[PDB]
């Protein structure tokens, strides 16, 4: 099986537990307006690769991983689109005593055997919930949030170590209603270890510019500690380790 990837960071510090080897896969079906990897969308592009090649790199960093309590992370655009390849990669990592992390948007269309097979070999999934209010979601992301929420149910329903990531963008996900909805939604499920909030940042805009596409959020400045603070409490009410 061939893997089409955008790039990889031999060892990032903000892509899950400890220091991790992150591979950014090519292609994404969503169109978040704040996406900092816009050049990650196209299905075509990015180098092809095999797990043999990947491991031939990830292993050399065993050191930083063990020492940081890290591992590897599948991210980029939407890794879940190359589910066959990813689960193969984790199967290889599992067999190296390596910890696996899947950074996804959970837009799972067909629940094939490979989905369960991937999750079977996945240690932690940082599932993004971009907006509980679908009216907003459809405009913020370009698609309904039903498939993602279903994937969330699915996960909880199988006790999968989850981290909910909620990117807080001004005027779109900073309001208190949306904060409760999330807090309520994820409360049901107890497999969601914590809720990591992420402040919006202008970056990866040039990726749009470079692609003659207009970056709408242009101008939008990052949210204030006050705001993040507010949301945090709203969610800490439902009893989550809401750590931003």
């Amino acid at each position: 099986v061939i893997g089409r990837i955008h790039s990889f960071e031999s060892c990032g510090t903000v892509d899950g537990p400890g220091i991790r080897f992150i591979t950014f896969f090519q292609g994404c079906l969503m169109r978040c307006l704040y996406c900092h990897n816009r050049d990650t969308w196209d299905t075509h592009g990015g180098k092809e690769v095999t797990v043999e090649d990947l491991m031939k790199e990830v292993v050399t960093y065993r050191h930083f991983m063990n020492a940081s309590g890290g591992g590897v992370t599948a991210s980029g655009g939407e890794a879940i689109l190359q589910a066959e390849f990813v689960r193969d990669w984790f199967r290889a990592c599992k067999k190296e005593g390596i910890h696996t992390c899947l950074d996804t948007n959970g837009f799972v269309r067909r629940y094939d055997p490979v989905i369960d097979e991937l999750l079977e070999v996945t240690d932690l999934v940082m599932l993004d919930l971009k907006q509980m209010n679908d009216e907003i979601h459809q405009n913020l992301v370009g698609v309904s949030n039903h498939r993602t929420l279903e994937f969330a149910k699915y996960l909880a329903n199988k006790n999968v170590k989850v981290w909910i990531r909620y990117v807080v963008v001004p005027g779109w996900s900073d309001d208190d209603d949306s904060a409760h909805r999330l807090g309520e939604f994820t409360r049901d499920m107890g497999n969601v270890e914590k809720i990591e909030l992420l402040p919006y940042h202008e970056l990866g805009k040039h990726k749009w510019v470079a692609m003659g596409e207009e970056y709408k959020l242009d101008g939008v400045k990052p949210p204030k500690k006050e705001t993040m603070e507010r949301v945090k409490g709203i969610l800490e009410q439902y009893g989550h380790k809401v750590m931003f």
């Binding site: 960071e9 892509d15 900092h36």
Partner: peptide, 6 residues
């Protein structure tokens, strides 16, 4: 810098 691919 979370999830930023250079």
């Amino acid at each position: 810098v979370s999830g930023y691919a250079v």
